[PDB]
Design a protein around this ligand. Sequence first.
Ligand SMILES: *[C@@H]1O[C@H](CO)[C@@H](O[C@@H]2O[C@H](CO)[C@@H](O)[C@H](O)[C@H]2NC(C)=O)[C@H](O)[C@H]1NC(C)=O
Ligand SMILES: *[C@@H]1O[C@H](CO)[C@@H](O[C@@H]2O[C@H](CO)[C@@H](O)[C@H](O)[C@H]2NC(C)=O)[C@H](O)[C@H]1NC(C)=O
Ligand SMILES: *[C@@H]1O[C@H](CO)[C@@H](O[C@@H]2O[C@H](CO)[C@@H](O)[C@H](O)[C@H]2NC(C)=O)[C@H](O)[C@H]1NC(C)=O
Ligand SMILES: *[C@@H]1O[C@H](CO)[C@@H](O[C@@H]2O[C@H](CO)[C@@H](O)[C@H](O)[C@H]2NC(C)=O)[C@H](O)[C@H]1NC(C)=O
Ligand SMILES: *[C@@H]1O[C@H](CO)[C@@H](O[C@@H]2O[C@H](CO)[C@@H](O)[C@H](O)[C@H]2NC(C)=O)[C@H](O)[C@H]1NC(C)=O
Ligand SMILES: *[C@@H]1O[C@H](CO)[C@@H](O[C@@H]2O[C@H](CO)[C@@H](O)[C@H](O)[C@H]2NC(C)=O)[C@H](O)[C@H]1NC(C)=O
Ligand SMILES: *[C@@H]1O[C@H](CO)[C@@H](O[C@@H]2O[C@H](CO)[C@@H](O)[C@H](O)[C@H]2NC(C)=O)[C@H](O)[C@H]1NC(C)=O
Ligand SMILES: *[C@@H]1O[C@H](CO)[C@@H](O)[C@H](O)[C@H]1NC(C)=O
Lengths: 50, 49, 99, 419, 86
Amino acid sequence: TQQLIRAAEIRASANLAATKMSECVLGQSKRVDFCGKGYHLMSFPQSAPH
Amino acid sequence: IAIPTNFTISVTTEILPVSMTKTSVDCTMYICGDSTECSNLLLQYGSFC
Amino acid sequence: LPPLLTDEMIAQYTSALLAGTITSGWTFGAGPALQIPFPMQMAYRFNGIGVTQNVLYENQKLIANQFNSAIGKIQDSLSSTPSALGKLQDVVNHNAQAL
Amino acid sequence: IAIPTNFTISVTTEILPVSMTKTSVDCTMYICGDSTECSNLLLQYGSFCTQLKRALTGIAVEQDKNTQEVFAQVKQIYKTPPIKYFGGFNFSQILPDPSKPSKRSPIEDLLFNKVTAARDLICAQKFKGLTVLPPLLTDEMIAQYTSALLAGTITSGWTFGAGPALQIPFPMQMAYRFNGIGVTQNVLYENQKLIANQFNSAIGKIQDSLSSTPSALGKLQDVVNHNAQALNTLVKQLSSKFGAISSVLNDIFSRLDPPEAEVQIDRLITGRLQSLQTYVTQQLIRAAEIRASANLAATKMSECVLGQSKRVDFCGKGYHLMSFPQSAPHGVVFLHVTYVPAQEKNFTTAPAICHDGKAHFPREGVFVSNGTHWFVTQRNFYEPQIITTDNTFVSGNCDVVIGIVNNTVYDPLQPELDS
Amino acid sequence: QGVNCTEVPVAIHADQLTPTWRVYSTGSNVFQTRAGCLIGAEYVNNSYECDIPIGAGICASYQTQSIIAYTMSLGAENSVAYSNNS
Ligand SMILES: *[C@@H]1O[C@H](CO)[C@@H](O[C@@H]2O[C@H](CO)[C@@H](O)[C@H](O)[C@H]2NC(C)=O)[C@H](O)[C@H]1NC(C)=O
Ligand SMILES: *[C@@H]1O[C@H](CO)[C@@H](O[C@@H]2O[C@H](CO)[C@@H](O)[C@H](O)[C@H]2NC(C)=O)[C@H](O)[C@H]1NC(C)=O
Ligand SMILES: *[C@@H]1O[C@H](CO)[C@@H](O[C@@H]2O[C@H](CO)[C@@H](O)[C@H](O)[C@H]2NC(C)=O)[C@H](O)[C@H]1NC(C)=O
Ligand SMILES: *[C@@H]1O[C@H](CO)[C@@H](O[C@@H]2O[C@H](CO)[C@@H](O)[C@H](O)[C@H]2NC(C)=O)[C@H](O)[C@H]1NC(C)=O
Ligand SMILES: *[C@@H]1O[C@H](CO)[C@@H](O[C@@H]2O[C@H](CO)[C@@H](O)[C@H](O)[C@H]2NC(C)=O)[C@H](O)[C@H]1NC(C)=O
Ligand SMILES: *[C@@H]1O[C@H](CO)[C@@H](O[C@@H]2O[C@H](CO)[C@@H](O)[C@H](O)[C@H]2NC(C)=O)[C@H](O)[C@H]1NC(C)=O
Ligand SMILES: *[C@@H]1O[C@H](CO)[C@@H](O[C@@H]2O[C@H](CO)[C@@H](O)[C@H](O)[C@H]2NC(C)=O)[C@H](O)[C@H]1NC(C)=O
Ligand SMILES: *[C@@H]1O[C@H](CO)[C@@H](O)[C@H](O)[C@H]1NC(C)=O
C-alpha cells in the first residue's frame, strides 16, 4: 500500500516534468514563473539519476 | 513611471524526480523461508500473493 | 529489477534535444526542423518578450558574455553545495528505509 | 535559413478516462451469507462496515462530480443551423445523426461499439452482496452536451466561452485562427479549397483508422477491466478456509459444538473483513487516479475546445488550430486540428540592411535572398516582397551590427512626388 | 435500490428486514426507475434543474406542497443565427 501511494506521487511529478519539457524546452512560455523567475527566454535539459 | 535602462541574463536550475526503483517480492521465501509445511499451510490462505 | 532504458540512452535523448534546440529553435517541436542562425533566433526570442530586435543586435557580445558567466556560476553551485539534489536522494532513502 | 513553402492540416486523437464504476457492498450478506445466526457474532466487532459504506458513497458521489465538471461547461444548448454549408468544410462525421434512435455521430457510435442459459457474472456477483449503481447522467445527456459544444464552436468560434455567442462565418473564423499562429489572412483566403479538402481527407482518415484498428481505446478498456477483476477476486475469496475446517458456515454450525465453532467462525470473519478492507483501499487509490485524469480532461476541454492554445503540444502535435469533443464509454475523445509546415527551401539571410548610412530591420518578417536579390518574408510561409520603408524600421548606423549587408530600400514617396 | 417492487414487501406481521415501517404502495405513487422503485413521490412531466439526485437522469424536489420526481433539464434552448455574410 505504501508503495502504491509513493508511485502515485512519483507519477504526478513525472507528469509535471513532461509538461515542463514540452513547454519550456520545445518552445517559449508566456506563463509566469513556470520556466524560472523573470521573462523566460529558453531552457536546456540534463539527465540525472532518477 | 519607472523604466529600466539595462538588463541581466539569468540562469537557474530546477530538479524534478521522474522514476522510482522497481522491486519484486517472493512470498513463500519471505513468509515461510525453507520450511515445506509452512508452505503447505500457506497454500490454504487464498490469493493474496 | 533494472530499468528498461540505460543511462547512455537517456544521455543520447538529452543530447538530441539540445542539438535540435540549438540548431533549429522551436521549429523541430512542431514539424520539420528548419535551421536558423543562433543570433537570429535569439532576436526572435527577444521579440517574444516585448523587446525590439535591434536591442539584441546592438548588445550581442555583452549579452553573450553574460550568458557564459551565468553558466559558469551554475557549476560552482554544484561544486560547493551538498543539498541541491535532495529530492532524488530523498526518493532513494525512502525506498531503502521501506525495504 | 530554411523557410516553408507549403502546409498540411492534421487531425489527431486523444483519449481520456473520466469516470469509474460505482459499486455498493452488502457487508452482512457478503460475510455471513444467509445464515441468520452468524450475523449475531458480527455485532461484536464495532462499526466495521459503516466506514466501508461511507467511503464507497464518497467515491460514488465523486464520479458524478467528475462527469459534471468535464461535460457541463455550457449554459445553453446550442443548435446547429438546418443548412449545413460552412464554406466547404463538411463536419458530417462529427455532427449528430437524426436517423438513428441514439442521436449520435458516426464516430461516437463506432467508439461505443468498440469498447465492451447459465448464470451471468453480474448475477453471480449480485447474489453475494455486490451491486452496481447507475450514473446520474445517461449517455443521451452526455451526447446532448457534446452536440451543444460542437454547435457553439462551429457557429460562434471562441465567443460563446467568454459570454454571449456572436455569429461569424466559418471562413472568417478560420482566418482569425490562422492569424493566431502567425500566418496572414490572405494565405487562407487564397487556399480555401485546398485547406477544406485537406481537412475533409484527414477526417475521413480518422474514420478509417478508428474503424480498422481494434486496440486504440485500450486506455478506456483498462478502466473497465480493472473493475471486473477487482470484483471477481472478491468472490473467489469466499472459497478459502482461512485455517478453518470448511468454508461453509452452515456445515460448521450443523456439524460440531459452539466451543470450536466460535474459533472457526472467528477466523472466517477475520479473513472476509480483511479482504473487504483491501478492496476498499484499492478502490480509493484508483478513484484518486481517475480524479486526476478527469481534472486534466476538464482543463483540456476549457483550453482547446473553447479557445485557441499557445501551449506547445497541449492540444496536439503542431500549431493548434481547433479541437472537437466526442463522448465515449467512461471517457472523452478530443480531435485536434493543427497546422504543419512542409516543403522547406534554403535561403541566405541577413540581420539588417545598410542604406544611406542607416541600419534597417524588418518589422514583422525576415530578410532572405534567392541568390541575387533581397526580399522580406513572413517567418512561417514563403512570400517575398520588395524591401521598402513601410516594412522596415531604422535604428543607428551600420558600424555596430555584425553581418549587415548593403542593399537598397525603396521609398514609395519619390515616384508619386516626381509624377 | 435494484428492486422490481412487484416483489416489494406486502407484509402481514413480519416478513421484511426493515424495522416494520411499511409505506403504503398502491396509494402513494409507486414509480419504477432504473435505480429501483420510488415510493412517496409523484412523477411529473415537467423538467427542472436537479435538486436531489435519484439517478439515471431522475431527480426529486419539494414543490407545489409535496415531493415530486422528474427528469432533469440540461439547460435552456438557444439557436445562433448563423450565416456566411453576417
Ligand atoms: C549594463 O550592465 C553591464 C554589466 O551588467 C555593463 O557592462 C559593464 O560595463 C563596464 C564599464 O564599461 C565594464 O567594466 C564591465 O566589464 C561591463 N560588464 C560586462 C559583463 O561586460 C553595461 O555598461 C551596462 N550598460 C550601461 C548603459 O551602463
Ligand atoms: C502544396 O501541397 C498540396 C498537396 O497537399 C499540393 O496540391 C497538389 O497539387 C498537385 C499538382 O501537381 C495535384 O496533382 C494534387 O492533386 C494536389 N493535392 C491536393 C490534395 O489537392 C500543392 O500543389 C502544393 N503547393 C505547392 C506550392 O507546392
Ligand atoms: C460529406 O461527407 C459525407 C460522408 O463522407 C459524404 O457522403 C458521401 O457522398 C458520396 C458521394 O455522394 C457517397 O458515395 C458516399 O456513400 C457518402 N457517404 C456517406 C457516409 O453518406 C458527403 O458527400 C460529403 N459532402 C457533403 C456536402 O455532405
Ligand atoms: C539546404 O542546404 C543543406 C546544405 O547543403 C542541405 O543539406 C545537405 O543535404 C544533402 C542531401 O542531398 C546531404 O548529402 C548533405 O550532406 C547535406 N549537407 C549537410 C551540411 O548536412 C539541405 O538538403 C538543403 N535543403 C534544401 C531544402 O535544399
Ligand atoms: C531571384 O529573384 C529575381 C527577382 O525576381 C529574379 O530576377 C528576375 O528573373 C526573371 C526571369 O528571367 C526576369 O524576367 C526578371 O526581369 C528578373 N527581375 C529583375 C528585377 O531583373 C531572379 O531570376 C531570381 N533568381 C535568381 C537565381 O536570381
Ligand atoms: C557597403 O558599402 C560601404 C560604403 O558604401 C562599404 O564601406 C567601404 O569599404 C571600403 C573597403 O574596401 C572602404 O575603402 C570605403 O572607405 C568604405 N566606405 C566608406 C564610405 O567608408 C562597405 O565595404 C560595403 N560592404 C560590403 C560588404 O562590401
Ligand atoms: C451564403 O449563405 C447563403 C444562405 O445559406 C448560401 O445560399 C445557399 O447556397 C447553397 C449552395 O448549394 C444552397 O444549397 C442553399 O440552398 C442556399 N441557401 C438557401 C437558404 O437557399 C450561399 O451559398 C452562401 N454563400 C456562398 C458563397 O456559398
Ligand atoms: C419490473 O416489473 C414489471 C411489472 O411486473 C415488469 O414488467 C418488468 O419487466 C420488471 N423489470 C424491470 C427491469 O422493469
